[PDB]
Every structure is written in structure tokens, then in C-alpha cells.
């Protein structure tokens, strides 16, 4: 691109800038010239894919799974979970092959307001994305995890729903837009098999548990920590400058006599 033409600098004495010019005298072969090359042409040698350590990929998938268990983190991510009876939500499904039957489970389990928020959020995107095979955006909502159940067909056409096997959970799904807290509907096979999947990681040991702010705040107000505290000396008194001779009280405060 931009280099397919034959252009040479006209020279140094023709009252023209020294940029390369075509036979007619037309600017060519430069970033500032119309039809010229990019100064630094973009190239496929860019590293498109980064690298992550398996222990670090598996830390995130586990931490995202844990974030799903919090019904405050789940509500912060946007998902509507008020009707949901309990988080984590496990549902004894069988083989659900009908969207009509899946909706009845989504309603009874209590995620309907969330699967409706997504349905009623389809819209044409802002930008040239609309022209680039990215025209419609729908809010993400529930994610069904399945093991040994045919729940794919019924829950797939439902909108804003995503489906994952317990054998290959996907971080991008667990934390949509780098936000942990996805409302996940779990089949009773998947939730029972989650401890088997973690065991099958050959030598993985789950990140050891750590405490939260609430535990630290409780410790700082604990009998031992509070008792050790010493009360500091009383603060210094400052007071803005006053000329003593202006006020007898100011003089009295400086020299009482």
C-alpha cells in the first residue's frame, strides 16, 4: 500500500518540497502525502495473544466461581436476583429440550426478571460496529452449568443465557467484562461434580482462603487490640496571632501582671 507507485524526489531547486513526487509532480510515498504509505504500517507480527500461567488461569476461574457465590457481588454485577431463593442456586433439572419448559424453570427458580432484562435490552450498537457484524447488543444474564443433562437445546434460544459444561468452565463467561459476579444456575449434577473437577486438575491445590475487611475490622475492635492502644497526649492549641496592646484581655493573657 502506498508503495505501488513510482515517485522520486523532484530535487532541491524547483521551488517544491523535497517529498517524493509522481511524474506529474504529485506528492507520493509519505505519511503526509495523499495515497502515501502509513509512516509505520500495521503488521500481523504484533503479538495478538498474551500468555498466562495455568495456576494463574485456574486461580481466576476459581475466584470468579467464588464471586458468583456472593449474593451482593452478584447484585452489584447488575444481575437481578431478588426472586432467586438462594445463591448459590442449584436446580434439579432433567433433560430440558423445550424453551417453553426452560422458561417455567427460569420462572419457578426465580431468574425470570433477569432473563427478561436481557430480552428487553436488544438494541443496535453505537458506531461502525453496526457495520462490522456486531449490530445488536443484549445484556448478559444467567449462565447454566450442566453435567450429564441435556439442558442445552431448551435454555439456548432463551436470551442473555450462556451454557457451560463443568468440565470446561470459561472465565470470560464467569466474569463478563472483567466484572466478577455472574448469576449461575447450576444443575444438581454439576454442583455435585464441582469437587471432582477440582480433584481431576492433576496437582492443583486450591488458593488458600484469606480473610476480608469485616474480619480485620472486627479484630481492630477486639478486646486484645483495643486494650493495647495508648491514648496519645492532648493536641497543641494553635490560635491566630493577635496584637496584645489592642485588647487588655490579650495583654492579660500574655502578661497577667
Amino acid at each position: 500500500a502506498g508503495v505501488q507507485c513510482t515517485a522520486h524526489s523532484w530535487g532541491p531547486g524547483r521551488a517544491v518540497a523535497r517529498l517524493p513526487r509522481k511524474h506529474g509532480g504529485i506528492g507520493a510515498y509519505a505519511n503526509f502525502a495523499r495515497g502515501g504509505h502509513m509512516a509505520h504500517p500495521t503488521t500481523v507480527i504484533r503479538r495478538w495473544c498474551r500468555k498466562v500461567n495455568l495456576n494463574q488461569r485456574r486461580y481466576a476461574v476459581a475466584s470468579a466461581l467464588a464471586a458468583s457465590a456472593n449474593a451482593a457481588l452478584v447484585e452489584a454485577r447488575g444481575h437481578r436476583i431478588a426472586d432467586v431463593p438462594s445463591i448459590p442456586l442449584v436446580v434439579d433439572t432433567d433433560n430440558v429440550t423445550k424453551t417453553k419448559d426452560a422458561l417455567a424453570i427460569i420462572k419457578a427458580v426465580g431468574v425470570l426478571r433477569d432473563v427478561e432484562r436481557c430480552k428487553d435490552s436488544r438494541h443496535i450498537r453505537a458506531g461502525r460496529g453496526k457495520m462490522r457484524n456486531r449490530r445488536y447488543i443484549t445484556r448478559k444474564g444467567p449462565l447454566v452449568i450442566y453435567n450429564t443433562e441435556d439442558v442445552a437445546r431448551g435454555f439456548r434460544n432463551l436470551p442473555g443465557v450462556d451454557l457451560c459444561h463443568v468440565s470446561s468452565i470459561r472465565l470470560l463467561e464467569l466474569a463478563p467484562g472483567s466484572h466478577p459476579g455472574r448469576l449461575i444456575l447450576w444443575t444438581k449434577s454439576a454442583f455435585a461434580s464441582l469437587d471432582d473437577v477440582y480433584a481431576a486438575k492433576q496437582n492443583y491445590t486450591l488458593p488458600r482462603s484469606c480473610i476480608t475487611q469485616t474480619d480485620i475490622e472486627r479484630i481492630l475492635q477486639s478486646d486484645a487490640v483495643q486494650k493495647t492502644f495508648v491514648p496519645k497526649r492532648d493536641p497543641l492549641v494553635i490560635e491566630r496571632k493577635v496584637d496584645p496592646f489592642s485588647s487588655k484581655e490579650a495583654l492579660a493573657r500574655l502578661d497577667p501582671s
Partner: protein, 177 residues
């Protein structure tokens, strides 16, 4: 105009707070800041800085080093703000109580098999906030490889090793090469 440049030496920079994304290290530092402010004790001031130190300035302390560094003070509790690793070379670990930011899986299993206790700064903050019966220990900062090539290899008093392969004689054979 005032002259506050003819005796003033410029201001230095420290790591007042941690640069770690890890939310746990930040929560421990905020808590120890509270204890130091609430009781102005050296153990809490030293530990608040150690948690704000960088990974390079916080070196690993193995259970072999910890045992030697605690031979006389066995009753006391160690408090490294760093990972405690294992020396497979010491084949009989003694019993000791160690508070560390992280313990290797082998160090935790060696210590508790031996009969000790692997604490954590949250347990330290409740049990011993001002570090009573606690010795804070540190690993050797100079141990790193990067730290051994710091200097000018090439000067007569360098005592430093050249960075790359070199494979040559002019300057390496002696003081007159």
C-alpha cells in the same frame, strides 16, 4: 523570595503504602497502620513498612535459616513479612511458631509435622498486635543475582563480574592485560 535552598537537602521518597493489587496485603497494612498510630510501638512501625516493601526488598526465609536464627529464642514467635520456603537439606526441622505472609506447601507441612504453628498476620494482629514475645526476621536482600552484577566490572577495584559472555583477554586476565 526566600532562600530555603542553602542548607535544605531535597526531600527523600519512601513506600508509605503498598503498591500490591492483592487486597489482603493492603488490608493488613491499613490495620497495622491503625495499631501503630493507636499505640506508637516500634514492632508495629517496623511491620507496617515491611508490608509496604517491594518483592525484591522482601526476600524468602527458609525453615533451615529460621531454626538457626531461633536456636536460643525457641519460645519466641518469628514474624517474617515474606514467603517462608523449605530447605530439603535440613532433614530434621525443629518445632517453632512462625508468622509469615505466605508459607510454601512444603514449609507448612514440614512445620506442622514437626509440631509448630504457621500463623498469619490476621492471627498476629488479634493475638499479638504489638508483637509481644515476637522476633521479626528478614532474609538476605543481597542474595539476588541482579545485586551481584551492580557496579562497574572493569575498574581495578570493581570486585564485580561482567554481564555477558565476554570470551576474551583484554582486561580480564589481570591488572596489566
Amino acid at each position: 523570595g526566600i532562600d530555603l535552598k542553602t542548607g535544605i537537602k531535597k526531600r527523600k521518597v519512601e513506600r508509605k503504602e503498598p503498591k500490591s493489587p492483592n487486597p489482603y496485603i493492603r488490608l493488613l497494612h491499613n490495620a497495622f497502620k491503625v495499631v501503630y498510630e493507636n499505640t506508637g510501638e516500634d514492632f508495629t512501625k517496623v511491620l507496617t513498612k515491611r508490608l509496604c516493601l517491594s518483592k525484591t526488598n522482601r526476600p524468602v526465609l527458609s525453615v533451615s535459616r529460621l531454626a538457626h536464627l531461633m536456636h536460643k529464642r525457641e519460645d519466641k514467635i518469628a514474624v517474617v513479612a515474606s514467603t517462608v520456603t523449605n530447605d530439603e537439606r535440613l532433614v530434621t526441622i525443629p518445632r517453632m511458631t512462625i508468622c509469615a505472609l505466605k508459607f510454601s506447601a512444603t514449609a507448612r507441612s514440614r512445620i506442622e509435622k514437626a509440631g509448630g504453628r504457621c500463623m498469619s498476620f490476621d492471627e498476629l494482629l488479634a493475638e499479638k498486635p504489638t508483637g509481644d514475645n515476637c522476633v521479626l526476621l528478614q532474609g538476605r536482600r543481597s542474595c539476588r543475582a541482579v545485586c551481584k552484577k551492580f557496579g562497574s566490572p572493569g575498574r581495578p577495584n570493581s570486585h564485580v563480574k561482567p554481564k555477558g559472555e565476554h570470551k576474551g583477554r583484554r582486561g580480564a586476565r589481570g591488572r596489566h592485560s
